[PDB]
Swiss-Prot record:
Species of origin: Clostridioides difficile
Residue stretches making up the GT44 domain: 94-466
Disulfide bonds: none
Cofactor: Mn(2+); Mg(2+)
Region (Glucosyltransferase region): 94-466
Membrane topology listed for this record: Peripheral membrane protein
Localization terms from the record: Host cytoplasm, Host cytosol; Host cell membrane
Binding site for Mn(2+): 284, 286, 513
Notes concerning its domains: The four-helical bundle region mediates binding to phospholipids, such as phosphatidylserine and phosphatidic acid. This promotes localization to the inner face of the cell membrane close to small GTPases.
Cofactor note: Has higher activity with Mn(2+), but most likely uses Mg(2+) in host cells. Required for glucosyltransferase activity.
Name this polypeptide is given: Glucosyltransferase TcdA
Residues represented out of the complete protein: 2 to 538 of 2710
Length: 537
C-alpha cells in the first residue's frame, strides 16, 4: 500500500509550518488511501492527481527539507501503477482481429490466418476490410509504375553512368507521383458529392479507365472477386460496423487510404478502433502462433547460427515435415547437419495434431488499464497487440495518434490545398512546420517532415511517429509516468517487460514477416533502381 498520511507527516516533519501545497498533497494521499472502489481507472486517476500535486510543491520549494520524502513518494507512486495494473486481471475477449484493406486478400495471408484459427477454435476471427476500396492498391501501383517510367525517360541519358546518384531518380519520380495523386484526388473531390453517391472504387475505376488505359470489366471482376474472397474468409466490413464513431478518426483513415495510398497507415487506425470497440488480440497477417516450449527443449543450438535465425529455422523445420503452409521456405534449415535435421524430423513426427506443435492462446489475462505489444530490435512493434475493449492505454494511444495528426494537418493542409507542385508544396509545409519547433518537439517535426514521400522514397518513415510504434511508445510513457500528450519521450522494450505480448504466444520470425522488413533504406533503394534500369532497356 502507499504510505499513509500520518506516516508521511512523520517522515517529512520539519521545524517549518506546513505549506498550503503540502497540505494538498496530504489530502490527495489520504483520499487515495481511503478509496473504497475497485475500479482501476479511478485509482489511476487519483494517483495522477496526487503525483501532480507533489510536482507543484517540489517545483515551488526547491530547497525544502520535505523533498526527500516527497521524492520517495513519487517513486512509490510509479510502482503502484504496476501493482494496480497487475492486481485485477482476467481473460481478454476472445477475438482475433486481422486487417486487409485495399485489394484482394492473398492466399498466403489466409494460410497464416488458418493456423491461428485451427489452434484457437473458441476465438472468433475478424478479418477487417473496406468494401468500397478494393482498388486502392491497383491505383497506387499504376501511379508508381507510370511515374517510374516518366522519371527514367526524363533521366535516360544519365541513368547509365554507373556513378549516377539514384536519389536524383527517386526525387524526380516523387514529383511525378505527387502530380498523379493530386489529379486523382481532385477528380475524386469533384465526384464524391454527386447525387449518384459513388464509392471510392467507382471513382478509382473511372479514373483508371480514363487515364491509365484500363478495362472496366477487368477491374470490376477484380473488385467483385475480392469482395467474395474476403466475405468467405472471416471478412467483416468496416463500412457496416461501428469502428468509426467520429469524423476526426475517419478523416485520418481516409487521408491515408485515399490521399496517400498508405495502406499500412490506414490499418494502423483500424486496428486501434477494433481493439477499442471489441477487445481481443490484433495480429498482422504475417504473424504465426507460438511454438510449444518443450517441443525443442532437447535441441542445443549451434553457436554459428543466430538467436533469431534459430527461431526461423525452427519454423522452417516444422513446415518441412508437416507442410502446414504450402511452399514454406526451407533455406535456413537445409544447411544444417543431418543429426540436427534427423533430430528435428524425429521430435516433429512424434506429434499427432497441430495443437501439439503450436500453443493455444487459452486465457490471456490482462488489466482493463493496459495494452500488450510485441517487441522487435529494442522497440515496441504494433504487429501484435492484446487489449480489453475500452482499455485506458488503448485510448491513450488513440489520443496520441489524434494529437499527432492534428499537428501534422495544421501545417500540411494549407500546403496541399494550394495549386502547387511537389517541391513548392513541400516548402510551404516545411516552412510552417519548422517555425513551430521547440526543444520538446523538434525530433518529431524532423520525423514527419517527409510525410508526403512515405512509401515512395527511401528513408521516409513518418508513419512510425504518427500512427505506428512511436505513438504507442509515447503513450506507454504517458501511462507509466502519469503524464499526457508526451511527444519528446518514448519508452523502449527494455522499459516495458510488464506489457510484453507473452513470448510463448507468438512467432514473429516468419517467412512473410522477414519478407516485409525489407524496408526502404539506401541498400533496398539501390537494388530496386537497378532493376528498374534493367527492365526499362
Ligand atoms: O496492402 C496492404 C498492406 C498492408 N496492410 C496492413 O498493414 C499490415 C502490415 O503490413 P506489412 O507487414 O506489410 O508492413 P510492416 O512494415 O511489417 O508494418 C509495420 O509498420 C506498419 C505501420 O506502422 C504497421 O502497420 C505494422 O504492424 C508494422 F509491423 C498488414 O497486416 C495489414 O493489416 C493492408 O491492409 N493492405
Ligand atoms: Mn510485417
Amino acid at each position: 500500500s502507499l504510505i499513509s498520511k500520518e506516516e508521511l507527516i512523520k517522515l517529512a516533519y520539519s521545524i517549518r509550518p506546513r505549506e498550503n501545497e503540502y497540505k494538498t498533497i496530504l489530502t490527495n494521499l489520504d483520499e487515495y488511501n481511503k478509496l473504497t472502489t475497485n475500479n482501476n481507472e479511478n485509482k489511476y486517476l487519483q494517483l495522477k492527481k496526487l503525483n501532480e500535486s507533489i510536482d507543484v510543491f517540489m517545483n515551488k520549494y526547491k530547497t525544502s527539507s520535505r523533498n526527500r520524502a516527497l521524492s520517495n513518494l513519487k517513486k512509490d507512486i510509479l510502482k503502484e501503477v504496476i501493482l494496480i495494473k497487475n492486481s485485477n486481471t482476467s481473460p481478454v475477449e476472445k477475438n482475433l482481429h486481422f486487417v486487409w484493406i485495399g485489394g484482394e486478400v492473398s492466399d498466403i495471408a489466409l494460410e497464416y490466418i488458418k493456423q491461428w484459427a485451427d489452434i484457437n477454435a473458441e476465438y472468433n476471427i475478424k478479418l477487417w476490410y473496406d468494401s468500397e476500396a478494393f482498388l486502392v492498391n491497383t491505383l497506387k501501383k499504376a501511379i508508381v509504375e507510370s511515374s517510374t517510367t516518366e522519371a527514367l525517360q526524363l533521366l535516360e541519358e544519365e541513368i547509365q553512368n554507373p556513378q549516377f546518384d539514384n536519389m536524383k531518380f527517386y526525387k524526380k519520380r516523387m514529383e511525378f507521383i505527387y502530380d498523379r495523386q493530386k489529379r486523382f484526388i481532385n477528380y475524386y473531390k469533384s465526384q464524391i458529392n454527386k447525387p449518384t453517391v459513388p464509392t471510392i472504387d467507382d471513382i478509382i475505376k473511372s479514373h483508371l479507365v480514363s487515364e491509365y488505359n484500363r478495362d472496366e470489366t477487368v477491374l470490376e471482376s477484380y473488385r467483385t472477386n475480392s469482395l467474395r474472397k474476403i466475405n468467405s474468409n472471416h471478412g467483416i466490413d468496416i463500412r457496416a460496423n461501428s469502428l468509426f464513431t467520429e469524423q476526426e478518426l475517419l478523416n485520418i483513415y481516409s487521408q491515408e487510404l485515399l490521399n496517400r495510398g498508405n495502406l499500412a497507415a490506414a490499418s494502423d487506425i483500424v486496428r486501434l478502433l477494433a481493439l477499442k470497440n471489441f477487445g481481443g488480440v490484433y495480429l498482422d497477417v504475417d504473424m504465426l502462433p507460438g511454438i510449444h516450449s518443450d517441443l525443442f527443449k532437447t535441441i542445443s543450438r549451434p553457436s554459428s547460427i543466430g538467436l533469431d535465425r534459430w527461431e526461423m529455422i525452427k519454423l522452417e523445420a516444422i513446415m518441412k515435415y508437416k507442410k502446414y503452409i504450402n511452399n514454406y521456405t526451407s533455406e535456413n534449415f537445409d544447411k544444417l547437419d543431418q543429426q540436427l535435421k534427423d533430430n528435428f524430423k524425429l521430435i516433429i513426427e512424434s506429434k499427432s495434431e497441430k495443437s501439439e506443435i503450436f500453443s493455444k492462446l487459452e486465457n490471456l489475462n490482462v488489466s482493463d488499464l493496459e495494452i500488450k505489444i510485441a517487441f522487435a530490435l529494442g522497440s515496441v512493434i504494433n504487429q501484435a497487440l492484446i487489449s480489453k475493449q475500452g482499455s485506458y492505454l488503448t485510448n491513450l494511444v488513440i489520443e496520441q495518434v489524434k494529437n499527432r495528426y492534428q499537428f501534422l494537418n495544421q501545417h500540411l493542409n494549407p500546403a496541399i490545398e494550394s495549386d502547387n507542385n511537389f517541391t513548392d508544396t513541400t516548402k510551404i509545409f516545411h516552412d510552417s512546420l519548422f517555425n513551430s519547433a521547440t526543444a520538446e518537439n523538434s525530433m518529431f517535426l524532423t520525423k514527419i517532415a517527409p510525410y508526403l514521400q512515405v512509401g515512395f522514397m527511401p528513408e521516409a518513415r513518418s508513419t512510425i511517429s504518427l500512427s505506428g510504434p512511436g505513438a504507442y511508445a509515447s503513450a506507454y510513457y504517458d501511462f507509466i509516468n502519469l503524464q499526457e500528450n508526451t511527444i519528446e519521450k518514448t519508452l523502449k522494450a527494455s522499459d516495458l517487460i510488464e506489457f510484453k505480448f507473452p513470448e510463448n504466444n507468438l512467432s514473429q520470425l516468419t517467412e512473410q514477416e522477414i519478407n516485409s522488413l525489407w524496408s526502404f533504406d539506401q541498400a533496398s533503394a539501390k537494388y530496386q533502381f537497378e532493376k528498374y534500369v534493367r527492365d526499362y532497356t
